[PDB]
Amino acid sequence: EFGSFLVSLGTSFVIFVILMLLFTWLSRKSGNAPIYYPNRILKGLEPWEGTSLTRNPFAWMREALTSSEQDVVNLSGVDTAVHFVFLSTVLGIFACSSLLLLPTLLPLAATDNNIKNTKNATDTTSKGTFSQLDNLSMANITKKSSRLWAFLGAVYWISLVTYFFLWKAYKHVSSLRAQALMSADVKPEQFAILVRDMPAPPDGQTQKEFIDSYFREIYPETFYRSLVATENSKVNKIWEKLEGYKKKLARLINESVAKLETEQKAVLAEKQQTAAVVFFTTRVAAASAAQSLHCQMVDKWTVTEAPEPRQLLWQNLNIKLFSRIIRQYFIYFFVAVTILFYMIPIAFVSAITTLKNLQRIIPFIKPVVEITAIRTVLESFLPQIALIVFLAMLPKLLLFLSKAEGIPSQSHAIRAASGKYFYFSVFNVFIGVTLAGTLFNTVKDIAKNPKLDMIINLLATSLPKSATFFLTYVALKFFIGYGLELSRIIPLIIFHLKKKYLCKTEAEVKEAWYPGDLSYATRVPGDMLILTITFCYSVIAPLILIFGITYFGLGWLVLRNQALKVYVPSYESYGRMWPHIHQRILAALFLFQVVMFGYLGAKTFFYTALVIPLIITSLIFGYVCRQKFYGGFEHTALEVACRELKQSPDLEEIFRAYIPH
Amino acid sequence: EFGSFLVSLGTSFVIFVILMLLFTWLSRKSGNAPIYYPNRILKGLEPWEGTSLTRNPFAWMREALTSSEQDVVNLSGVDTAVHFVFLSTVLGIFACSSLLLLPTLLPLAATDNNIKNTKNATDTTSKGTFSQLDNLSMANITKKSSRLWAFLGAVYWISLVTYFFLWKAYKHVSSLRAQALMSADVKPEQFAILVRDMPAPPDGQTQKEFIDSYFREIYPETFYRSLVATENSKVNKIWEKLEGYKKKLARLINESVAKLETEQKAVLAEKQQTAAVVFFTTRVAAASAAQSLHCQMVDKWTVTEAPEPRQLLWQNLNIKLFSRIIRQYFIYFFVAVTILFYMIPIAFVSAITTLKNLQRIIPFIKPVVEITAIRTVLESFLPQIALIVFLAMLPKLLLFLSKAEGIPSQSHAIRAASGKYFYFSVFNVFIGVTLAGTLFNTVKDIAKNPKLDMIINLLATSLPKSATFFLTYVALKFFIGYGLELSRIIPLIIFHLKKKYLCKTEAEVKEAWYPGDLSYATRVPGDMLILTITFCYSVIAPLILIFGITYFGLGWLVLRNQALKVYVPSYESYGRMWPHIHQRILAALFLFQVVMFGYLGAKTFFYTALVIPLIITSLIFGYVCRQKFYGGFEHTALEVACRELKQSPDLEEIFRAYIPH
């Protein structure tokens, strides 16, 4: 496989060179401003800096490297800042860990020869079964070791560093959240409530008046209005989407309006059911109402904190708690079945990966056609591309599933997608590649040698070989992905094709060049894969830390110049993602700990019980942390909803902001 | 060991007969009313029923078996009712599970002979190594089985039943909580708040006025007063305790008062620091204030729900969040070290348990003096008594530790004790006894036979033998404990000794006969041990279900006639224990599942992966449940603090209720 690693890494450098070189040329062209420098045009701030020259080649860099933390916050938001905190803390963990671990352990994993001793019993002339593997706590560390002590103390170094960083971070994100919250404006969200599970109207009372009185009693000076309506039904949601389509085509009529009106009225003709956004009067009242159980026997009047208008997911605002729980259960069962099918395809990937060992026996004669040329390529671009493809259809499905539970707020739904993706990822990817590699190799080598005193050694061999494969994958990703992102070559092609053969109006060009968000449902989930792989295989094969620094490090560079210069944020959750990210980073430390308790044992290190203490510490850190911080990342404090509102918060305008269409 | 089981069970029946017979005699004596029928005297309701006869022998039974659920609630409280719900749901799980499982599996574990086949390879005439073990998915089920299918489908039956019951329960407890909450009275707790982490006063402002303004701004019509004071210091806590001692002796003076005043004043002379109980005006305001984050950056103004006066743990009201987290961490580390030392003593217990196998070679022939007589007794009363002793010093320590974290409210502190005890229990007890038995027996008999095809079989043998030992333990407990409880012979002795040779006044007798609570920090933790043992060893040895029904079943009988007739409740948490109990019961289902995935595998049942699906379901059930219910078991709803307060809630009296001394 060394030959193949060399190809993949090599080729990817070629692509990064060509794509990044393209960037340094296509950006200078001012006619490409709408796809290289947006978020500087939409928010009128001039395509780039004062035109002047052509911006010394390395200019994007200077800007990114000297962009103030606060500058990101003001320009983009307090969500971009949190993503950047994520990237940075991971980077740091990796950095320090790397330093120490790397030097020590790399010099200590070549100064042994368990691979060569294993090679004393490798059936018959088994050539090229390793190479370069001899540089990673692999099959090259003799069982009873006296050197494995260093590969346990390492677990501590990574772990302790993970703790310092995650704590320091939670604090820093919290500071950001508050600061931002205490420095905002009116905002149509700081005055609402979202009741979602209301009981039925009584005798012949109108739904509106029912809600009206209830809230007007508890708070008899703050109730203002109440927008129920079920948003003219979701069938009208669809009809208005179609009316938008029609006006776009202008840039059916009568009968279509008829349809809309009729369906909407006929559905409201009995009950608009639950879901209203009781708009309060002053903010403190709305804030207090938010964090307060309005009824015991939790199944009636569930009051949340009311999402901003842009993310209220009016579709699933109804539900009824019974249905919500049924949905939760079914959705979780489906994600588990999907984890199993993906295990199937990932086994497929690792198989495609070890070609010699595959052709050895599994299909035996079937792939005897593998020569040397085809071999290298089919195990240097194919296996990797497969993983990308499979784990790319996931983000979409996961969101659709999560948004079918009932979660109001797109923010929480994106967070749930991220979570289900973490599960998938972890389990599938890691376990799969690792175990499958191991199994293949060790299978037609275990059929002969029995006992057990050798089987564990062979299984460890194979664990580090799967490590080398994941390394090449991470590399590929990093290079090509960041290349494409900085070049935005895909979007460039699209825009400069539309603005040449498809754009009819100037508004059309405007529509075409609108950038998008940082897609926090494909970025963070995907970056979590890299986190887990580079955490687990950090001591078992310490080279996926020198590839890991690069991924997350190029992150803070590429993505910064893709946030102060292109992606314009969609929603704003004032930092409400860190809790999720923190739990996941800590769960990687935990999976890593469980695996570095297993592997250390297979390589017979009787004192491997000294990793159990850490398996506990992680779990305690969890509880302790959540208690201290999660609270603040949940609600808007009363001390933020009591700040001076100079201009009397004009209501009615606020009421008209949550208005459906 | 069969001989010993027969002795222990037999002897314990003797004790239950003698103690329960004593009860049916000593209770009739009316002069024993103060220790057999309190909580009927304190709350003037006449010692028993209309005196009339002598109450047909079985009278306690009739009363208990026909005591209304609500009658328990009104007489005692909404905490006794929840304990009874606990006992009952566990009973039910066990009941149904038992039915099915038992019949099927017992007839299927004697109709095989893996014990006899193992006995074909028992070195040299190993006699008495088993007996009666041949009736419990033990060493008597042949490896590849075709009968083990039934012992997997069983895991499902127990699991599914556990789910039905736990759900049905959460609902029922919630209904109780609310009903009770919507039918109470004024109560000095429904109008307070407990701020605990206040920032320092500003320039030269007085602590009081600082708190005063802050809250009087956010709520400018509901702030009434504020009791800070640090309760004249805890040194004065001690001094007032001593003044109470002095008045009791009356039933030092001057210099002691001097001490008190001086220390108190000197400590308040700088700052009474944090912790005030801002008393609001109307209940809805207090309720809203409770569930509301009064400041972002959670480290200032932490507002809880304010414990009732009787449980405000004024001692640890101060702290400061930094210190609280340090304490949390240290306390958890200490509980882990204690778990390790207890593992040491529990290994000691199982060792004392298998005497033949112990003397085999472990202490050489140091104990070759074991004959037959001494043998039976030293393994029928000794091992068991040891476990009781050890696991009885735990409750006290655990509370002391938990109340040193900082938890305000004795209710939560008792809950935390319960939790740490669960951990201890589970780990220690189960793992210990099981594994140690196994190890002993399979430690000399493995030094010979190598391979592995036999080692697993031997390990399973030993797992079921440890099962038989736990069975006898549970029995012992049940019998003797409930005997003592119904007889209250220990307390009788004490009272009728004081009221004969130690009581000086009538108030002294009153003091002596005051019963106590149901000690929810020794009952529930201890009953959780029995739950776990009888859950784990429910399929591995299905006979600890017919001993389990009895424990929890005699519970609802004995303890009922020990709650409507003796223990007068101390605090009232309106049901806030069920969340804890539910999580723990579910964690037993989980430990059981993990062990019935291990054992089923050791007895080579290749399709043992079908227990993994359930290991997931449990965890999902967890999340789903907490989400739906825990909320309601956290705060007092606004719809409960808006109910008609006919008599204007006299404040000042409420303020004077939280007054320190």
From Swiss-Prot, chains A, B:
Main location: membrane
TM annotation in the entry: 4-24, 85-107, 147-169, 324-350, 377-404, 414-437, 463-494, 520-539, 541-559, 578-601, 607-627
Extracellular side: 1-3, 108-146, 351-376, 438-462, 540, 602-606
Domain of life (superkingdom): Eukaryota
Alphabetical UniProt keywords: Calcium, Coiled coil, Ion channel, Ion transport, Membrane, Transmembrane, Transmembrane helix, Transport
GO MF term (any one): mRNA binding
Membrane topology: Multi-pass membrane protein
Cellular component GO terms, alphabetical: chloroplast envelope; nucleus; plant-type vacuole; plasma membrane; plasmodesma
Record localization: Membrane
Consequence when changing R576E: Induces a closed conformation
Pfam families: PHM7_cyt, RSN1_7TM, RSN1_TM
Outcome reported for the amino acid change (mutating R584E): Induces a closed conformation
Cytoplasmic side: 25-84, 170-323, 405-413, 495-519, 560-577
Similarity field: Belongs to the CSC1 (TC 1.A.17) family.
Subunit structure: Homodimer.
Function of the protein: Acts as a hyperosmolarity-gated non-selective cation channel that permeates Ca(2+) ions. Mechanosensitive ion channel that converts mechanical stimuli into a flow of ions: activated in response to membrane stretch. Not activated in response to membrane poke.
Descriptive protein name: Hyperosmolality-gated Ca2+ permeable channel 3.1
The organism of origin for this protein: Arabidopsis thaliana (Mouse-ear cress)
Originating gene: OSCA3.1
